[model samples]
Structure formats: C-alpha cells, structure tokens
Target: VVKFGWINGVLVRCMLNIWGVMLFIRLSWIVGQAGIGLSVLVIMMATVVTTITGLSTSAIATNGFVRGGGAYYLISRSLGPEFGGAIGLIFAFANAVAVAMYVVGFAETVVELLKEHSILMIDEINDIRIIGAITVVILLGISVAGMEWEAKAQIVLLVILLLAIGDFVIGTFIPLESKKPKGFFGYKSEIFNENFGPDFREEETFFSVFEIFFPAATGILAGANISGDLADPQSALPKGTLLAILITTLVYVGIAVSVGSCVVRDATGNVNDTIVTELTNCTSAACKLNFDFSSCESSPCSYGLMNNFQVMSMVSGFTPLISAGIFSATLSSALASLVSAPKIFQALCKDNIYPAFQMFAKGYGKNNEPLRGYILTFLIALGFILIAECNVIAPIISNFFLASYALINFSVFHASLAKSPGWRPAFKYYNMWISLLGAILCCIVMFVINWWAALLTYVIVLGLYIYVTYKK
Candidate 1:
C-alpha cells in the first residue's frame, strides 16, 4: 500500500478517467451532431490544448519534488497567491461538480431502463433527480467514511468500466442482427456518408459541441492529482500523461467514426439517406426494459436517441456487460472524485492562503482526511446534482476545469519566460511558445464555450483572491 506507483499504473488511472462518461454517454451523440470529419476535428482541438498543457504541466512537474497537490503546488508556487486562488478553487470546484455530471449520467441511464423494469413502479415518481441525489449522498458517504484506498483496491473496480469499453470498441465491428421495425440496419455506408457532416440541432455550432465534449479530455489531471504518490513524478508526468491522452483520443475518434458509420442521424429516413426529420428524443418502453435504444417502439427508429447514449448494448456485445460498465464507472468515478478532491482541498486549506477555509483545515483522522471539506463539497455537489442534466452541467463544469488548466499553462509560460535560476524543469522537451499557445487556446475555447460562465468563474476566483488580500 505504501509503495510508490509507476508510469504503468499512472497512465491507466488517468486513462480510466478519460474513458469516462463523455465517451460512454456522449461520443455517439457528438458524432451524430458533427459528422466524423468535423467531430474528429473537435477531438483534435480539445486534445491540442490538453497536449500543450500536458507539456507545460510537465514543464512545471516540468520542479522540485512532486507532492499530492502537485498542480496547486506548481501554479501557486510559480505565480504566488492570486493565481493560487484562481487554480485551486477552480480546479476543486471542477472536480466537485464532476460528481453531479457523472451521477447525472448514471441517473439518466437508471431512469432510462429502470422505469419499465422498476420492481416497484413509481409511475407516480416522474423525476430522476432523487436517484441522483441518493447516489450523490451514498457516494459522499463512502468518500467520507475513508480516504486511503490503495491501487490494488482501486484497480479491481477498473475491470468493469475498462472491459466494457472493449465491448463497445469491439461491439461496433459486429453489426446488429435483423433490423427492428424502428431501428436502422447496422453500420451501412449510405448512413455513414450522411453522418459524415454536421446536423446542428437546437442551433448548435461546432464550438458548442466542443464545449460539451472537452471535459472528457480533461482527465489529464488525474496523473497530476496523484503525483506525490509516484516514485518518479517527472519521468511519468509527460510520458504517461501524453500516452494517456493519445490513447483516449485515438479511441474517441475511432469510436465516434465507428459509431457514426452505423447509427443513422435521421431516424425518420426509412432507407438510410432518404428519410428526414428533426425528431430526436426516444420514448420507447420496451427497449428501455432491455436497455436498448437501437429501435424505438418496434421499428428501427424514427429519430435516433443521439445514438440513444445507450445504443452500445444493441450495437456491442450485450446489455449486461455494457450496463455493468456504465453503472460501475459512473459510481466509482464519482466515488473517486469525492474521495480524491478532499485531499487537494484539504491541502488548499493548509496552504492557509485565505481566512475562509480556516474551518475545513482541521482534518478528521490519522491520515488527516478532510471530513469538513467532504461535507462542504458534498453540499456543493448536492445542489448541482439537482440541476439534473449532464448536458447543461458540462458547460459549467468544463469551464471550471479549463480555467485552472489555462492558468497552469499560463503559469508555465510565465515561469519559463522569466528564466530564473530555479526555473529548470525536468525535461527540455517543450518551449515557452508551446505553453503560450496552450494558454491562449485554452482561454479562447473557454470564452467560446460559455462567455458568461467563464467570466463568472473568473470572478469567483478573483473574489477569493480579493477576499484573501482583505484578510491579509
């Protein structure tokens, strides 16, 4: 348990998070909205920022000995108090609400399939929020109960989520059997040609689709999050992180293209490319019972459910493996986020930059677990869970993630630009220009994604900075 981890474990942990809800629930939807050509570009843009940030991040780890709050350490140390507040609060808040997004995804899947098969039909109960709230509570309770989980213990949970991705990856190659009355036949070229370009539903643009898709790539931090626990932090950060990003990107573009080829965008078109309509929502009960969204009612489909977000069950191996993966990842990923977020928040509290966190600074146990921070962020998560839509939740959550990420890129640029005696990072691989590009591109995407929310998050960070100064 006490042994330091290696690049092998580091990449998997990071990759596991990258393979999360966005890929599972939203990739097909994204592909359906922007065709393979454009959707692939979205992944490229998102990865570009992350790839540059990853290099800059290494430029920063890219330091002295790494620790638990490595990202916080890098930015706070490099830029001092103001940027500290900016990255710390933004990063933690990003992780905090992440609980809501993933749980929201799980709840949707639950409500999607369970209502038809709900052992106790609460036909009376219409909202999916309660299940999410329950999930939020249970997950927080589990996180609060203990803080130290070794790799051995955590890796076991990896089996279900990881294996399921394989199922979906391998699933696309194996086409569907005989078509349902509502569903389109599997993976045909005619549909593929139509799906190769943008549909732009609800006045959506390429950038809007990108904002929703960016958070999936944001798992680059998982390696940074656990940096202290590594034997050689510098050796792993760039290599593992780059490897992690590359693998997830390949799978993402491949999955999106593969999924797009098979799943028709226009369900109304009876024969692949011929029929057309704007209808997209799926309301079938029979398929829900079986966790299949390939066909609505009995036909192949009129309007596909953004590949229904659960179409993999039919397209892939089986509902059991697919569903098992979803339930396991959504549950455990949230579980890990709540558990890991506190460690950094606790460290932030101890950094003692502000008077506001004084209360949460007092951790609870021998390991110094942050019970107070857990409860505090739990309440933050509870409010968000009630918001109940991952689509809406992502725009906000991703801004929080990118805000810190951009700031990290900026910090590296600043440090590298200064060229102090202590400025030597582990590798000479990335230059200041690369970090500068990452900084500008990240903030650019942030504004393009959500202008007001981007400013709102900046203001929150700024207020915290001002609040800290006032206390000083």
Candidate 2:
C-alpha cells in the first residue's frame, strides 16, 4: 500500500514463508503419527482456518490502501485504535515466538544432519540451544538488511525450495537401499491402511499433533503481514495470500500421500509371510531405529516411518540435494520470521499508541527499517530459543496466533456490521457471518488444542482490550 513493489514481492515473500520448516521438517513426523488420512485431515483442517482468514484479509484490504504493520495495521485501521492496539500487542508476542519457532526448526535440521553426517561432537540438548542461539544472531544481522533485501533473499530461497520439492517427488520413483524390501511400493493397501490411523506418540493426541502441524498453515497471510510494502495491496495482498495457500495446500497433501504409500509406518522385512507378521507385530523398544538384528533373528528391518523423521533424506533420489532443500527451508523461514516480526512490531510502535513501545518507533535508512524493533524482537526470540523444543514452543505460537486471528476475523465482522460508508470493499467473496464463524472457530480450537493457554490468552486479551478502551 505504501510502497512501490508488485505482486511478486507479496507472492514470493509469502510463498517462501509458507513452504518452509513445517512442510519439510515436521511433515514426515505428522504423516507417521497421524497417517495419510488424518494427516490430510490436519492439512484440510488447517486450510479451513487460513482460507477463512484469507477471505477476511481480502475483505479488509479492498476497503482501501493498506499500510505497514500487516495484521495490526489492517485491524487498527478498520476497527479503530482500541481493538487495533490490543491485537497489535497480542500479535507481537506471537510474531516474536514465531521467529524463535523457525529458528528452533532450523536448529533441528542442522543438528540432526551434522550428527548423522559429520564427525560431529555435540551435546543433544545443549547443542540445540547453541545452534538455535547462533541462528538468532544470524537472523538479526540479516533482518538489519531491511525489507526489500529481505524480500529479494526469499526469491532465491524459493527456487532452492522448489528444487528440493522436485527432488522429493522425483526421488519417490527411484530406489534407495534404506527403504529395503521394496524400494518404494506404489500405494500398497497394507502400507496405506497401516499409515491411515493415528499411531499416537506417547502422551500425544490428535489435538496435540494438530498444534505441531498448524504452523505450516500459519504463514498463509505472510503477504498480508507485509501489506505496507506492496505496490498494489488491495489487489496483490488477496491474490498472493490465497494463491500461496492453494499451492502449499496441494504440496502438503501430495507429500502426505506420496509418503503414505512409499514408507511403511513400522519395521518390515521379507521372509515367510508369517515372519513378516512377527516383524510388524513386535513392539520391542530395541527393535526400532537401527534394528537389533539379534532380537529379531536378523530379519531385514526396513526403515520405519515413525522411527526416523529424516527418512525422506535417507531414501530420496539424491540425499544431498534433498538435505540442501531442508537446510535452506528452515533458514529461509527463520529469516522471513525475523523480517516479519520486526515489521509488525515497528508499525505498532510508529503509531505510538502504547507508550511502552514508543522507543522502538525509530526507523533506519530508505526503506525505513525498524532498527530498534529488531533488537527488542531479537531478545524475545533469543529468550524462546533457549527453550529449544518446537513441540514445547509450537503450541504457544499456535495459541497466540489463534487468539490474534480471532481478533482479526472479528475486526472484519465488526467493520462490515458497523454500517460505515468506508467499509465497502472491492472483494466480494466474503460475508460477516463467515467472518464471525471464523472468529468463533478460532476461539474454540484455541482452547481445544490447549485450553489452559486459551483461557490464559482469552483473559489477557479481554482484560487489555477493556483497559485500552478506558485509557486516556
């Protein structure tokens, strides 16, 4: 809205963020735990939230020019200062955590690959913390590179990400020794059925698993997050937003299916059909991973999908290229998060609604990059990186985003119903009822996934919103 960039900035900016970390890193884990069917359910269920929010974003953008602050700007402009400032603060924490989230995701890739390939001397828990801390340092350095450079950086990543995706799909047909008995059975009924139900990792359930996968869908509005940078926000924001979601949607579901048919969920090998039954049925702890052949009478133990999330790297047509894709995927997303979070924070500070954040309102060079905001956001992200577990970190982000999104949907619904002449938008594919439904659904799912967090966030948002209304 405020800048001179075109659809590609919006599109590439968003598509890069959407396709990272969660798709490449956690996908196999999701497929292994939830299977093809439920994984697909998670994919579509994720689509429902994003698509509805996408519709809401379109409805808001067409009303007029969008400025910086992405979601905070859209909400504040349409709904006014009170609601806008409240959500601005809410989304800030979410974005801060998102920066950490992707860094942690990248750390996972870096550590696992190093340990597996290098003479890597490393401590499991501590090294993850170490690498993740290093990632935050690297991110703030590049985030200091400013917005357009940030956008340009992602275009390069998008190409590499696309290649890795190609490597994945093409690799599916080639044989790899790691896959054993049948290199990859093309959609065998046994494999599909075996992977079609939730295997439930210890102490995990569908909702818990959903929290892990939901972040893949969270970047659907990444273009909207940078709404201020667009040359034609009203047009570019909605198209880029929806198109990215559509492309990523297909990629995710397709990956789940390809993986579902190709990889067996548990260990399997050949011999008598009865011996295959014994290998499949044995739930011994020693039998997982490398397979203690001594215990299983030395039957060949194929890679178990559940046992190795990195199985895709092992069995892909070319392991290095696939690994290349993974390394960049996480790094690209982390860079994007660092960029997105500060931008959002900077916009809020620039508006000067909250005195506490006003010091960060200052900007640097031509693009007016938020220099102070970057330092503050880096600390937040660095703080979370110390925790170093995406499983623990992921749900907090999901809950924070869900709460902010609920507010955004409600912003659209409120504006449409307020009967203000300014509310008429060029986008026609949305209605207030649908927006309301999106808000409520987000609210419900926030709790369903983690009621403790939902209640905590609900009280915080409601309390602050009320306080904002009474301020000055």
Candidate 3:
C-alpha cells in the first residue's frame, strides 16, 4: 500500500485528474462561447492559477514532514488546526459529492451508448440515476479492495484514455466525407452563428467561459490527495503534481488548436466545412431519449448539452471503446476521490476535532486504509444518487475546491511573509507574492462565476469552523 513512488504517483494523478472526465464533456461549451482563440486564453489563465496553487502546495509540503491528510495536512500544520479542520470537513464532503458527479457522468454516457446500440430502454435522466447508483457500488467494491488494486486499475485505464485521445487526433485528420451531414441539418449553422460567431453573446463572456474551463485545471491536486500513501510525499508530491499539470496543459492546448483548425466557418458566416459538429449532433439526437430540436431553447435538450455529447461522439466515433473511455475517465476520478475523501475525514478525526467523529479516525488493512471512512463515503454518495441532481450539486463541489485552493495559497503566503524558519522549502521558484496572487485570483474567479455561491460557501465554512472551535 505504501509502495507508490514519483512515477506511479504522477501517473495516478494524470490519469485521475489531468485526463479528466470534464475535459471530454465540457470542451464544446468553452469552444462555443470563446471560440478557438479565446478558448486557448481561458485555458492558459486557468493553468497559471492552478499551477500557482500546486506551487503553494509544494512549498508547504517541502517545508516539513507530511503524512495522511494531503492539502489538509499541509494547511493544518501551517495555518493551525481550526482552519485545517474546517477545510478538511468541507473538502471531504466535496470529494464525496465529486465521486457522485463522476459516477453520474459515467452513467449518462453509458445510457447514451446503450440507446445508440439499441440495447436498452433509456430514459436519459432516470436511467442515469439507476445506472449511476450501481456504478458507485461497483467502484466502491474496487476501492474497498485496497489502494494497490485501485492504483493498478488506474494504469490500465490510463492506457485506454490515451487510445481515445489518439482516436481524437486521427479523427481530426480524416477528410470530410460527402456522406456526412451537410448544411443546417449537418452542422447546425443557426446555433453556432446566432449564439457564438464573431460578436459573442452577452451571456457568454470571458469570465463566464473562464468559470466553466477553469475547473478543468483543478486536477493538479489529485496527486496531493493521495499523499498519505506515497513513500516520500515531500519530494514526490511537488515533482509529480507539477509535471502532470505541464503535460495536461500541452495536451489541452493541442486538442483546442486542432479542434479549432478542423472545425471552421466559411465565407457566408455559416459554420461549414466541419464534420465534427454534424456527426456529434446526429449521434446524440439518434441516441438520446429527450432530444427536442424545435424547442431546444426551453427543453432539456439544450444546445449546450447537445454540443457536449456531440463533441464526445465525434472524437470517439460513437464507438463502444470511446464510451468505455468516458466510463474509465470518470470512474477513475471517482475512485481517486473515494480514496482521498476518507483520508481527509480520518485526518480530521485523528486531530480529535470532535468526540463523535473520532470513531471514524482509525484505519485498517495493510496500508492503513480508512475502512469506516469508505462506508461513510459510500453512504454519502448513495444519498446524493437518491437526490439525483448531479447538475445542481456540481457547482457546490467547485466552490469547495476553490475555497481549499485559496486557503492553501494563503497559508503559503502567510508563512512566506512571516519568513518562518520552518518555511524553507527545497523548491525555489515560488514566492509569497505569487501565492498571494493565486489566492486573490481564486476568490475573484469564484465570485465572478457565482458570487452568491461563493458567499454561501464562505458563510457555511466559517460557521462550521466556529461551531467546531466552541464545541465541548
């Protein structure tokens, strides 16, 4: 259980976070709003912010010995237990919810694939909940088996993920065929030209697009989440985390540029000469249960959702392998979160934050895995599945991560500004100012995207901190 070195750690992080499920599902939204050029800008900005957070994490991690809690461990050690406990609580729940999100994503794609193959009676939303719950149970079994099994599974899944990316690259190079959908029927000129095009819609500005794309960069923390299991977290965490981010950035940029080149507009302001959109739309319409082209504006079959499914379909040719890639990407992430969430919970209880919570603090198995914590995670995920509102809960998960990122940066900034003797990190590139800037940007981005949600997050976290501090 404690055998993972830098290479294995980086692979797990990249497979879990960098090659993310969100990248597969949300690329079209960013492209639709910001188009090709601006989409690149959004990605760069998000990468800068996330890289800074990773640096902050590395700085803190390097400054001292670390064990078990990942970000929570670093922050608690630096910022003190009250703040750490608070972030730990929220982060734990966020991870749990994120597990549900990934499973829901897997289930949705599964249902879509099943319908495409005439294999099942898919009702989209309802079918997703059913399949999602079952997927969670299956993943839980894998996770509960042990960390080594989960880590090994990730390696296999990563290979599958790479093949899917290859498919995307090859698909882009293939010439547009006459058999492909043409004109309005094929490409949906009306949606692309009217909604996006040159002028840009009022609702889809730089910040709006940034909000959606920025989360795509949040996966750098994946390595940190498994810090407990690593043999040498201090050295390995920094190297693995930074390398993963760099590789992911290059891949994202390549995909964005290639997609932009492949899909283009012709002289008459029509989105012509691109087979990607038509193929995506055709597959989605043919496969999905509640597809309403006429009342798309109001229906569940919104253009945005269609665009996402189509982009995925286009990349993988609506093949079963591609669908499995989607499942693997999401389920791998879900397993990562499942592994990490309980560690955070165990960390919180290990600190003796509450008498009630101490019961879950103990670890079991060869690697000291969190058995009780896994049960709790499974129960929480089950509850979320019962609610069946993955979309509604997604923003909350984002808010929690943003808050954690901000605090991590702030902790490093505090240590750096104080010039604490304990703050001497082996890493040389970071400074107090950069950490502060990252913290500020995280807050700004959070507020710009949804000020109300950000405010709610702060209020809830602060309230919990106070309650925990004053408790008997």
RMSD values for the candidates in order, in angstroms, are 6.0, 4.7, 6.6
Which model scores highest in TM-score?
A: 2
Question: What's the residue-level lDDT of 63 in candidate 1?
Answer: 75
CA-lDDT, candidates in order: 0.68, 0.72, 0.65
lDDT of 2: 0.72
Candidate 3: regions farther than 4 A off: 66-73, 76-79, 176-179, 182-204, 264-308, 315-318, 351-370, 387-390, 419-421
Candidate 1 lDDT tens digits, 346-431? 66555544335426545543445434667667778878877765768888767888888888788778877774445667686878
* Candidate 1 vs candidate 3, lDDT winner: 1
Candidate 1 scores a C-alpha RMSD against the true structure in Å of 6.0
Model 3: per-residue lDDT, tens digit, 1-472?
A: 2676889766566546656556777665566557665778788987888789989888866766555344444565545556767767777877787777777767777776677675775466788788888888877766666557666778888888878778766665554442232111233334334323332444657776666565567756657767666687777888888888888888888876665444322111113423333323443232121122322333333233224454544543435666667777887788877777877777665654443432443543344443566777778887887755345656766788888888778767876776455455677787879889999999988888788989999899899888866771
Q: Write one digit per residue (lDDT tens) for candidate 2, span 378-403.
A: 78888888887577888888888888
Candidate 3 achieves a global lDDT of 0.65
